[PDB]
Write a protein that binds this ligand. Structure first.
Ligand SMILES: *[C@@H]1O[C@H](CO)[C@@H](O[C@@H]2O[C@H](CO)[C@@H](O)[C@H](O)[C@H]2NC(C)=O)[C@H](O)[C@H]1NC(C)=O
Ligand SMILES: *[C@@H]1O[C@H](CO)[C@@H](O[C@@H]2O[C@H](CO)[C@@H](O)[C@H](O)[C@H]2NC(C)=O)[C@H](O)[C@H]1NC(C)=O
Ligand SMILES: COc1cc(/C=C/CO)cc(OC)c1O
Ligand SMILES: *[C@@H]1O[C@H](CO)[C@@H](O)[C@H](O)[C@H]1NC(C)=O
Ligand SMILES: *[C@@H]1O[C@H](CO)[C@@H](O)[C@H](O)[C@H]1NC(C)=O
Ligand SMILES: *[C@@H]1O[C@H](CO)[C@@H](O)[C@H](O)[C@H]1NC(C)=O
Ligand SMILES: *[C@@H]1O[C@H](CO)[C@@H](O)[C@H](O)[C@H]1NC(C)=O
Ligand SMILES: *[C@@H]1O[C@H](CO)[C@@H](O)[C@H](O)[C@H]1NC(C)=O
Ligand SMILES: [Cu+2]
Ligand SMILES: [Cu+2]
Ligand SMILES: [Cu+2]
Ligand SMILES: [Cu+2]
Length: 547
C-alpha cells in the first residue's frame, strides 16, 4: 500500500520522433496502482522533472480529503521541480478500474496510469473470476512537446493542434509509421475469459472500441459494477473507465485466424473542425495455435463511423448500475436543490494590439452557465481553509443567466461571447443535488464528458434538445441508473444526475476534454462541514506546496 512515483524526464520515441516527456518512474504509460476495496494507499511523489506538476486519483472520492485530490490551483499549488509531496488515497465505495493522471496543464498527456481495485479479502467479483486481466489505456501522442502544443494555443487563442496518433498502452499500433514493431499485443488461450480494463486517457475525443471476432460483456464502469450487457463495440469518453469480459473461443486448430485486431477510433461530429481520426490498433493473439494461422493480417473489427451519433447513443443507453444484495444502490429520491448548467464553447475578445486565431479572430474560451472559469493563484482549498478574501466568489449560479433555445443550430454571433471568473457553488453537508447538464449549440453542438471530483453520481436521465424541467423527469431511471464519475452529455442534448453532497471539501467539476478545462468549462463545489467528526474536512497536512 505504498508507492514512490518519481516524475522523470524520459526520452521516448513514437512515429520515429524522439522527445523528452514527463513520465512516472520512466514509464509511459505509468505504473498501475493495485489496491483492494477500502484500502488506504500512500504515494510519495518526487518531482524530478522540469516543471510544476500535480497528480490526481481519478474517481476516488477521497472522503474528507481534498488535500490529496490534486487539481492544480483548486486543492493545491503545484509540486515544484525538486520538491515532493505525499498523497493519501482513501478508497471506499470504489471497486473495479479507475486511473491516475497529472492534473496540471496538459501534463497528463504522458503522466497517467491505471488504478485496479480488486474485491477485498473475503469477497469476489459478481461474475466468474477471469483467467487474466489487462489494462487497456487509450491515449494520444503528439510529436511536438505537449507543453508547446498548449503554449501555442494559449498564444494564438486558436484551437489546440490535433494529436499525431491515437494509442493503446502508449503504442499507435500497426497502421502508423515506425510503429508496427511495438504494437501492443496480448496472448489468449482458447476457452478462457479475459477482463479488459479500458481507460480513456486521451485529452480530446470520445472513442469507439472493439475487438475483431469477439463480443464484449460490459460489467463495470468508474469503479461501480454495471448490469451486464454484451455488445460488439463500446463508446468510452476521456475520464471514463469500462470493464468488460472477452471470451477467447475462436478455433485454435488452424481453421480460423489466430490474431485479431483490438481497435479504437474517435466519435466526433463537428465536421468543421479538425480531428485526429486515425485509428489505433493492438493485437489479440491465440498463442496455442499453429503458425499457419497467423499467416495473414489480423482480422479487423467493424467500428461505427466517426460521426455515428446513433451508435454512441445506443451504447450509452445500455448503462445501468448492478443492483443486488451484495451491491446495493442508493438513488436520492427527494432533491433539495436543482441546477441547470449550460455547457458552451465560447470566445472572448482578443487582447489589445494582437490578432487571435479563434472564431471571428477572437480568443477561444469555454463556460458553465456562461462563467468561464479562471484558475486562482492561491488554490481554492487554502483560501477556503484560511478564509482568504479576493480569491473566489461563492455565487456560481444554479441556472444560466439568459435562457434561449440552447440547442438551436448556428446561434447568432453575439451569443459566442462569455466572461471569465472564479466562482464556486457552496452547499451544506448532505444537500441532495440534481444537476442537469445542458449542451448548447454555440460554436457547434458537441458531446462533453463532464466529470465531478469527490463524488460519483447517478445519471437519472438523458435526451436530445433542451431539457424540459416539467416533462423529462417523468421518465428518469430512479431504479438502477448508472453510477458514474464522468458522464457523456449528449451532442446537442442534456444529462441529469443526482448525488448527496456528503463529502466535506473542495471539489472540481469540469469537462474532461483538456482544451475545454483550460478554456474554462469548469467550476468548484465547496461542501461545508456538517455536524459530527465524520462530516468534518480533514485538517491541512503540514507539508502542502506553497502558493
Ligand atoms: C455571456 O456573457 C457575455 C459577457 O458578459 C454576454 O455578452 C455580452 O452581452 C451584452 C448584451 O446582453 C453586451 O452588452 C456585451 O457587450 C456582451 N459582452 C461581450 C460581447 O463580451 C453574453 O450575452 C452571455 N451569453 C449568454 C448568457 O448566453
Ligand atoms: C510554479 O508554481 C509556483 C507556485 O504556484 C509559482 O510560483 C508563484 O508564482 C506567483 C506568480 O503567479 C508568485 O506570486 C508566487 O510568489 C510564486 N510562489 C512561489 C515561488 O513559491 C511558479 O510561478 C510556477 N511556475 C510556472 C512556470 O508557472
Ligand atoms: C464545439 O466547440 C468547439 C469549437 C471550436 C472552433 C474553433 C475555431 O477556431 C473548436 C473546438 O475545439 C475542437 C471546439 O470544441
Ligand atoms: C521532501 O520535501 C520536504 C519538504 O516538504 C523535505 O523536508 C524532504 O527532505 C524532501 N525529501 C524527502 C522526503 O525525501
Ligand atoms: C500546429 O499545427 C500547425 C499546422 O496546422 C503547424 O504550423 C504548427 O507548427 C503546429 N504547432 C506546433 C507547436 O507544433
Ligand atoms: C486503420 O486505418 C488504416 C489506414 O486508414 C486502415 O488501412 C486500417 O484498415 C484501419 N484498421 C481498422 C481496424 O479499421
Ligand atoms: C494598438 O491598438 C490601438 C487601438 O486599436 C491603436 O490605436 C494603436 O495604434 C495600436 N498600436 C500600434 C499599432 O503600435
Ligand atoms: C428551438 O430550435 C429547434 C432547432 O432549430 C427548433 O426545432 C425548435 O422549434 C425551436 N424551439 C422554439 C421554441 O423556437
Ligand atoms: Cu480524470
Ligand atoms: Cu477526477
Ligand atoms: Cu479533474
Ligand atoms: Cu467539453
Amino acid at each position: 500500500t505504498h508507492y514512490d512515483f518519481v516524475i522523470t524526464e524520459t526520452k521516448v520515441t513514437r512515429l520515429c520522433h524522439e522527445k523528452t516527456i514527463l513520465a512516472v518512474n520512466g514509464q509511459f504509460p505509468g505504473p498501475t496502482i493495485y489496491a483492494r476495496k477500502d484500502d488506504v494507499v500512500i504515494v510519495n511523489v518526487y518531482n524530478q522533472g522540469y516543471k510544476n506538476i500535480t497528480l490526481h486519483w481519478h474517481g476516488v472520492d477521497q472522503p474528507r480529503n481534498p488535500w490529496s485530490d490534486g487539481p492544480e490551483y483548486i486543492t493545491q499549488c503545484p509540486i515544484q521541480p525538486g520538491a515532493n509531496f505525499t498523497y493519501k488515497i482513501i478508497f471506499t465505495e470504489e471497486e473495479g478500474t479507475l486511473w491516475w493522471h497529472a492534473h496540471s496543464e496538459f501534463d497528463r498527456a504522458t503522466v497517467h496510469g491505471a488504478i485496479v481495485i480488486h474485491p477485498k479479502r473475503g469477497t469476489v467479483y459478481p461474475y466468474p473470476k477471469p483467467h487474466k486481466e489487462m489494462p487497456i489505456i487509450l491515449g494520444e501522442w503528439w510529436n511536438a512537446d505537449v507543453e508547446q502544443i498548449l503554449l501555442e494555443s494559449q498564444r494564438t487563442g486558436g484551437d489546440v493542434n490535433i494529436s499525431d496518433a491515437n494509442t493503446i498502452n502508449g503504442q499507435p499500433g500497426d497502421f502508423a509509421p515506425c510503429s508496427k514493431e511495438d504494437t501492443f499485443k496480448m496472448s489468449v488461450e482458447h476457452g478462457k475469459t479475459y477482463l479488459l480494463r479500458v481507460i480513456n486517457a486521451g485529452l480530446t475525443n470520445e472513442m469507439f472500441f472493439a475487438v475483431a471476432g469477439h463480443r464484449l460483456t460490459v460489467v463495470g464502469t468508474d469503479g461501480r459494477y454495471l448490469r451486464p450487457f454484451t455488445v460488439d463495440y463500446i463508446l468510452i469518453s476521456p475520464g471514463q473507465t469500462m470493464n468488460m469480459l472477452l471470451e477467447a473461443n475462436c478455433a485454435t486448430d488452424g481453421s480460423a485466424n489466430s490474431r485479431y485486431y483490438m481497435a479504437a477510433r474517435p466519435f466526433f461530429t463537428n465536421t468543421a473542425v479538425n480531428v485526429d481520426d486515425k485509428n489505433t490498433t493492438a493485437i489479440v493473439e491465440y498463442t496455442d495455435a499453429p503458425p499457419s494461422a497467423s499467416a495473414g493480417p489480423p482480422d479487423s473489427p467493424d467500428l461505427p463511423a466517426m460521426d455515428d451519433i446513433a451508435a454512441a447513443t445506443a451504447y450509452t443507453a445500455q448503462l445501468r448500475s448492478l443492483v443486488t444484495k451484495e451491491h446495493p444502490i442508493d438513488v436520492p429520491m427527494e432533491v433539495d436543490e436543482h441546477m441547470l448548467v449550460t455547457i458552451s464553447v465560447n470566445t472572448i475578445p482578443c487582447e489589445p494590439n494582437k490578432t487571435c486565431a479563434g472564431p471571428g479572430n477572437n480568443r477561444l474560451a469555454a463556460s458553465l452557465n456562461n462563467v468561464s472559469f479562471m484558475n486562482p493563484t492561491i488554490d481554492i482549498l487554502d483560501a477556503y481553509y484560511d478564509s482568504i478574501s479576493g480569491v473566489y466568489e461563492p455565487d456560481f449560479p444554479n441556472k444560466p443567466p439568459f435562457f434561449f433555445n440552447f440547442t438551436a443550430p448556428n446561434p447568432p454571433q453575439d451569443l459566442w461571447f462569455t466572461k471569465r471568473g472564479t466562482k464556486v457553488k457552496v452547499v451544506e453537508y448532505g444537500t441532495i443535488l440534481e444537476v442537469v447538464f445542458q449542451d448548447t449549440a454555440i460554436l457547434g453542438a458537441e458531446s462533453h464528458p463532464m466529470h465531478l471530483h469527490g463524488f460519483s453520481f447517478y445519471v437519472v436521465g438523458r435526451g436530445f434538445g433542451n431539457f424540459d424541467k416539467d416533462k423529462d423527469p417523468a421518465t428518469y431511471n430512479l431504479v438502477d441508473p448508472p453510477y458514474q464519475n464522468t458522464v457523456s452529455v449528449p451532442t446537442g442534448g442534456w444529462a441529469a444526475m443526482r448525488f448527496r453532497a456528503a463529502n466535506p471539501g473542495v471539489w472540481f467539476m469540469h469537462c474532461h476534454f483538456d482544451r475545454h478545462t483550460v478554456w474554462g468549462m469548469d467550476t468548484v463545489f465547496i461542501v461545508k462541514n456538517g455536524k459530527g467528526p465524520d462530516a468534518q474536512m480533514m485538517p491541512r497536512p503540514p507539508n502542502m506546496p506553497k502558493c
